[PDB]
Design an enzyme around this catalytic site. Structure first.
Site, PDB file in Angstrom:
ATOM      1  N   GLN A   1     -77.957  32.385  40.988  1.00  0.00           N
ATOM      2  CA  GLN A   1     -76.733  32.607  40.238  1.00  0.00           C
ATOM      3  C   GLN A   1     -76.032  33.876  40.684  1.00  0.00           C
ATOM      4  O   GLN A   1     -76.625  34.946  40.677  1.00  0.00           O
ATOM      5  CB  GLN A   1     -77.064  32.720  38.759  1.00  0.00           C
ATOM      6  CG  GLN A   1     -75.908  33.108  37.883  1.00  0.00           C
ATOM      7  CD  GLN A   1     -76.284  33.009  36.433  1.00  0.00           C
ATOM      8  OE1 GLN A   1     -76.840  31.996  35.980  1.00  0.00           O
ATOM      9  NE2 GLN A   1     -76.065  34.081  35.704  1.00  0.00           N
TER      10      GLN A   1
ATOM     11  N   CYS B   1     -73.658  29.425  34.895  1.00  0.00           N
ATOM     12  CA  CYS B   1     -75.043  29.048  34.585  1.00  0.00           C
ATOM     13  C   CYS B   1     -75.233  27.610  34.028  1.00  0.00           C
ATOM     14  O   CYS B   1     -76.234  26.962  34.323  1.00  0.00           O
ATOM     15  CB  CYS B   1     -75.677  30.074  33.631  1.00  0.00           C
ATOM     16  SG  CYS B   1     -74.982  30.073  31.970  1.00  0.00           S
TER      17      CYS B   1
ATOM     18  N   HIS C   1     -77.136  31.839  27.924  1.00  0.00           N
ATOM     19  CA  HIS C   1     -77.605  31.480  29.258  1.00  0.00           C
ATOM     20  C   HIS C   1     -78.307  30.114  29.226  1.00  0.00           C
ATOM     21  O   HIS C   1     -78.964  29.767  28.251  1.00  0.00           O
ATOM     22  CB  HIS C   1     -78.575  32.565  29.756  1.00  0.00           C
ATOM     23  CG  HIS C   1     -78.906  32.473  31.214  1.00  0.00           C
ATOM     24  ND1 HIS C   1     -77.942  32.374  32.195  1.00  0.00           N
ATOM     25  CD2 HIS C   1     -80.096  32.353  31.850  1.00  0.00           C
ATOM     26  CE1 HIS C   1     -78.519  32.183  33.366  1.00  0.00           C
ATOM     27  NE2 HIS C   1     -79.828  32.172  33.185  1.00  0.00           N
TER      28      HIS C   1
ATOM     29  N   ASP D   1     -83.969  29.148  36.780  1.00  0.00           N
ATOM     30  CA  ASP D   1     -82.998  30.098  36.240  1.00  0.00           C
ATOM     31  C   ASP D   1     -82.476  30.926  37.410  1.00  0.00           C
ATOM     32  O   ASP D   1     -83.220  31.718  37.971  1.00  0.00           O
ATOM     33  CB  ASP D   1     -83.701  31.014  35.224  1.00  0.00           C
ATOM     34  CG  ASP D   1     -82.783  32.081  34.647  1.00  0.00           C
ATOM     35  OD1 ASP D   1     -81.690  32.323  35.195  1.00  0.00           O
ATOM     36  OD2 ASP D   1     -83.163  32.682  33.620  1.00  0.00           O
TER      37      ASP D   1
END
Length: 206
Positions: free
Chosen positions: A85, A91, A145, A160
């Protein structure tokens, strides 16, 4: 440009359509981690997306987790499609890409699918390169998130893009992914016990 930061099955399913996926998989709400609400989710589930808040409390755990894995290592299968990211508002879109990229062979792409083309072009790029390509790749356009939880080669991976790598959360299967991913979700919640803002959606067979 990006998927809005709210766990919203219908907007996500509309975006999937627009990315060129036939609706044989559709997101649904996970109404709670309780068995009574968990058993409501259509199966098979091939991905869980968790929307949660990035708190100081969250952040100290994350840095500890990174330090512990750098000391003690972990296994990440080469099958795992990971993307970094670079923009936080991306996200949700990154979570969707992780869910689909790591289940690509379960999906039914339309011929002109923009996501299909992104995935095949980005198959051998690095996690960092993939973030740069995503920034360039105009076609993928529609505190909090998203992470994606998926089953790859017998293990549960938290994807993530804020993190340096996938997080291996242990063994799991096609059959138990929903339960095993919600166990990880409950661990997130336990760490931040006063925080209400945890909402999950499941990518379910349709």
């Amino acid at each position: 440009r990006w998927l809005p930061l709210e766990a919203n099955p219908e907007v996500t399913n509309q975006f999937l359509k627009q990315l060129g996926l036939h609706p044989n998989w559709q997101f649904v709400d996970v109404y709670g981690m309780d068995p009574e609400l968990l058993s409501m989710v259509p199966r098979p589930v091939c991905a869980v997306l968790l929307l949660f808040p990035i708190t100081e409390k969250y952040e100290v755990f994350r840095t500890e987790e990174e330090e512990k894995i750098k000391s003690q290592g972990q296994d990440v299968t080469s099958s795992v499609y990971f993307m970094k990211q670079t923009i936080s508002n991306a996200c949700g879109t990154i979570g969707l890409i992780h869910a689909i990229a790591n289940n690509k062979d379960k999906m039914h792409f339309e011929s002109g699918s923009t996501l299909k083309k992104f995935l095949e072009e980005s198959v051998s790029m690095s996690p960092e390169e993939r973030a740069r390509y995503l920034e360039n790749y105009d076609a993928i356009r529609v505190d909090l998130h998203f992470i994606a939880l998926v089953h790859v080669d017998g293990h549960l991976y938290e994807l993530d893009g804020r993190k340096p790598f996938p997080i291996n959360h242990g063994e799991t299967s096609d059959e138990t992914l929903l339960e095993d991913a919600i166990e990880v979700c409950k661990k997130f919640m336990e760490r931040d016990p006063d925080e209400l803002r945890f909402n999950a959606i499941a990518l379910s067979a349709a």
